[PDB]
Swiss-Prot record:
Function: Cytokine that binds to and signals through the IL1RL2/IL-36R receptor which in turn activates NF-kappa-B and MAPK signaling pathways in target cells. Part of the IL-36 signaling system that is thought to be present in epithelial barriers and to take part in local inflammatory response; similar to the IL-1 system with which it shares the coreceptor IL1RAP. Seems to be involved in skin inflammatory response by acting on keratinocytes, dendritic cells and indirectly on T-cells to drive tissue infiltration, cell maturation and cell proliferation.
Keyword Protease found: no
Protein name per Swiss-Prot or TrEMBL: Interleukin-36 gamma
Compartmental location: Cytoplasm; Secreted
UniProt lineage: Eukaryota, Metazoa, Chordata, Craniata, Vertebrata
Coiled coil feature spans: none
PANTHER family, per the entry: INTERLEUKIN-1 FAMILY MEMBER, INTERLEUKIN-36 GAMMA
Organism per entry: Homo sapiens
Changes after translation: N-terminal truncation leads to a dramatic enhancement of its activity (>1000-fold). Proteolytically cleaved by cathepsin CTSG.
């Protein structure tokens, strides 16, 4: 059983890698030779409590600094935020903390990442140097299929 998160990097099919610019995750071409952000993933303990058939629910964060991805709902639409949060705190909670959770659905070499709290909103990248965001639009102007370079 998982006793710590698995770490690695994430990129999209246009080979844009996730990086931390200030306080935002941003996708940039690997060619830029920037330092990718180190991502941290851990599976929720209680998948039976969540929807089945949508992928494995995971907590998703970055390291150095330690922050977790979160779907915030202050306005009309949910938006993707980084919160100062210990991933192992989330893992230690006696019930799933839905706004920090994402369904990872694998298809071949890639995974989509869907908000558990806001169904059919997906983590996405788009153009070079744009923030990683949540979108309800699949297939359009947004990349939602990610290569998760972590040792599952």
């Amino acid at each position: 059983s998982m006793c710590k998160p698995i770490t690695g990097t994430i990129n999209d099919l246009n080979q844009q890698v996730w990086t931390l610019q200030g306080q935002n995750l941003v996708a940039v071409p690997r060619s830029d030779s920037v330092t990718p952000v180190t991502v941290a993933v851990i599976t929720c303990k209680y998948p039976e409590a969540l929807e089945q058939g949508r992928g494995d629910p995971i907590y998703l964060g970055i390291q150095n600094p330690e922050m977790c991805l979160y779907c915030e709902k202050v306005g009309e639409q949910p938006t993707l935020q980084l919160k100062e949060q210990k991933i192992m705190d989330l893992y230690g909670q006696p019930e799933p903390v839905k706004p920090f959770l994402f369904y990872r659905a694998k298809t071949g070499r890639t995974s989509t990442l869907e908000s558990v709290a806001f169904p059919d909103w997906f983590i996405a990248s788009s153009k070079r140097d744009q923030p990683i965001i949540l979108t309800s639009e699949l297939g359009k102007s947004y990349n939602t299929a990610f290569e998760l370079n972590i040792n599952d």
